[PDB]
Amino acid sequence: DLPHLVNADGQYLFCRYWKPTGTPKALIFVSHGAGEHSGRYEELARMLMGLDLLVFAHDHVGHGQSEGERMVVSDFHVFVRDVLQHVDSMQKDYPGLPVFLLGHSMGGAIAILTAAERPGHFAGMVLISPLVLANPESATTFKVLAAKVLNLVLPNLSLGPIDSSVLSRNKTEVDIYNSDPLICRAGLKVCFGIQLLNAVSRVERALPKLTVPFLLLQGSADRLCDSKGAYLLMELAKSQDKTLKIYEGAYHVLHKELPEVTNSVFHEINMWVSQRTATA
Numbered sequence: 001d002l003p004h005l006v007n008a009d010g011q012y013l014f015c016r017y018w019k020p021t022g023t024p025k026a027l028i029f030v031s032h033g034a035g036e037h038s039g040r041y042e043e044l045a046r047m048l049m050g051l052d053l054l055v056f057a058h059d060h061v062g063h064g065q066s067e068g069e070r071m072v073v074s075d076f077h078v079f080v081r082d083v084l085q086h087v088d089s090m091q092k093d094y095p096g097l098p099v100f101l102l103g104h105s106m107g108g109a110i111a112i113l114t115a116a117e118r119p120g121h122f123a124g125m126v127l128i129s130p131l132v133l134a135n136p137e138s139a140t141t142f143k144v145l146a147a148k149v150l151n152l153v154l155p156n157l158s159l160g161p162i163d164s165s166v167l168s169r170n171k172t173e174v175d176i177y178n179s180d181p182l183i184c185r186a187g188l189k190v191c192f193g194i195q196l197l198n199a200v201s202r203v204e205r206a207l208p209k210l211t212v213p214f215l216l217l218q219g220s221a222d223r224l225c226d227s228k229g230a231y232l233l234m235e236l237a238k239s240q241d242k243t244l245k246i247y248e249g250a251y252h253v254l255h256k257e258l259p260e261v262t263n264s265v266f267h268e269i270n271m272w273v274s275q276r277t278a279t280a
């Protein structure tokens, strides 16, 4: 019934397209975060479409309208593999067009790993508070062993849900998040937590080979993706074209923050993509 794609595992992924009026100047894949879905990028995608970019996305496996057990993945690479399948299909239909990636949180880790796998292939990357760092206690050898032991007997055991108030200072946006039936707000499963640990470890190893141009947007008061991870990405990525913008006191969901932050986020992405699309 709906726009879709069939991944390498035979699973249906729900697809979303925002096609401009005329001929597109570039392609841009939108990569959503953990627990959320592509429908949350409607406004950002309409702005990008207004620059004559063909915006495309899919709900990651186990998310939104895609198939799979909710917030579960055999291996984190499945997400990267599926992004590449979607990118390769779009590029076949639009040959010679530059292709960008836009990722938020876990979607940002997916974008980094997607670009690292194909050096020199992507024109640029927009990262909104990407997942790059593991929490202090969470990644010790003891904690990794304990979680792996737990995973063997209770893989679907929930770590406990987070306070949704840490997502944004915009109370309306916290309320929208809390009432969206396509969002999984259930606590993080032990098996998925291990996969997010794999993601962060793989990101760290990928940084010395990351050369793709990028715009990095980060809130200073982010409790999910600590701002120090954004500084480390600026330092360790080998990219010749890298920009960091810090939003003072802002939380995690920058594109759904207080109007002053959200308007700046939209404007900065608009300018950054526009300058690298005129380049084509």
Ligand SMILES: *C(=O)N1CC(c2nc(-c3ccccc3)no2)C1
Pocket: 032, 033, 034, 035, 104, 105, 106, 107, 131, 133, 134, 135, 138, 188, 193, 196, 197, 200, 224, 225
């Ligand atoms: C963005 O999509 N993500 C989800 C939020 C996050 N990361 C973690 C986590 C847990 C253990 C090890 C690494 C990362 N929990 O919530 C940022």
